[model samples]
Target: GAELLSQQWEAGMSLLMALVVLLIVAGNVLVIAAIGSTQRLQTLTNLFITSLACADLVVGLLVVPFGATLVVRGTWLWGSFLCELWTSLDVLCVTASIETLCVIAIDRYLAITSPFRYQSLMTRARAKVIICTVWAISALVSFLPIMMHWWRDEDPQALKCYQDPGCCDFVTNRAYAIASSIISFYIPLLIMIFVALRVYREAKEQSRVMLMREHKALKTLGIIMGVFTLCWLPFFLVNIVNVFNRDLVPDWLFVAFNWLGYANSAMNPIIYCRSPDFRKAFKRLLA
Candidate 1:
């Protein structure tokens, strides 16, 4: 009877995870399609948005399904190589997503602070290059260390899981955990906050009409950033804390925080669709 009850629970969780994966994939695909097909939506900013959606799409397609299975089963059925691959991919996508957000914030700041030179400074070619750099840096941080087994607390050949044979937690060393978290999350967060505040200050001095338009854009991006912070802060905080005191956070909390971070990928498309341009494009695509 107990086994049957747990099986039902697993089924329910799988269904929920499926819904999340579907939402992430469908929403991001719509975003990419909307940007691609709509002439008006084809701006340098939307280019970054497209890149963000692509990263999220990768998360939905490659990362989340495997992670969900691991979470549900409480053991990694996938072997050591797969575990490394999955972890690297997970880091890469998340790093790209966060760095894209930071770049967007900086782009907005430049647009607001120097509206005249913004065009000359942030061209489409430059934006494309920047996007490429973002992914390159993300891959460097994720794949290099992970592939080399630098994150592990012990030797790579030792072949120990976090808790048990099948368990698949990161079990990272302090130096790598701190460095990776800073690179992936904290530094970008700080930059985003600084740029947001700077943009807000600049907006306050403008005329009402310009302010209204800028305010709308600012609000949309602000919401996106806010959502990003809310989703990721707990995960990173827990990650750093666990490095120092492994017993401080329980297993379920860590997993829950991780899912919270994953949920961020799904939230962005919904937020983007809040913009009228995106909404019209989405409707046009559907029709």
Candidate 2:
């Protein structure tokens, strides 16, 4: 029975991963076009969102396809060089994405917690600074050690295929994994949750309709944070564990966690398209 399930799971995963990549590409592209082409979305909040869309869009475009292919073929068709390349791109883009979410939360936190002061606190120049800071930190983390050869695979039998032990070792160093995970997920998670709660409480002071809108806005951000956590937490948690006890996790689980995290790119757009503003913009684009 177990053998039969394993045989079928591979076949099912092929189709599933393909669909995941397709949805990620289509959904994020729609977000970029919908937000960029719409003048109404040119506010500070939407500007941060547009930055996020760009970050997610890069993951969808560069990372997910390679991931989907790896899932289907059960091996890396590309060489060792491309594997490192893919990891660098994946880390840079996903890190930027997570940071952008934190920035958006900070932006909203300022607006909600100090309505009058928000304009002065979060000016246009400061917004660009925040976005630039996010990308700068992301780039430093992703490529600094990589370019320094700190993650070199000493195993000359270098990982040419997916299941190879050395395959992802370059990207999963103990110190690096722990540091990156903390910066990218754990710290941001705490800060965002705090800001979200503050926003929820502060919204009570508004009119009925405005309060309702605030709730919906909070709900949308909640879904975004929820999806991000569920998708990424598993991957980073396993990475941390694997750093200490490599033998505990199976290779299959590694690939599964990877695809799961990458799948978040697809989920972001699905959440946005549920918004009436985004839906209308898309319909107009179609028209």
**On residues 160-275, what C-alpha lDDT tens digit does candidate 2 reach at each position?**
42346334434444566677678766777777778777766776664778767767866787789778878988888888887788789897788678778887887877787667
- TM-score for each of the candidates: 0.93, 0.84
Q: Which tens-of-lDDT digit does each residue in 149-196 have in candidate 1?
A: 788777453345654657677778889989999998899889889888
Q: Poorest 10 consecutive residues of model 2 by lDDT?
A: 153-162
Q: How many backbone clashes does every candidate have?
A: 0, 0
The C-alpha stretches of model 2 lying farther than 4 A from their native spots are 1-18, 152-171, 204-206
Q: What's the residue-level lDDT of 191 in candidate 2?
A: 79
In model 2, what is the error at residue 260, expressed in angstroms?
A: 1.1
Q: Among these predicted structures, which one has the highest lDDT?
A: 1
Worst 10 residues of 1 by lDDT: 155-164
- What residue pairs clash in candidate 2, if any at all? none
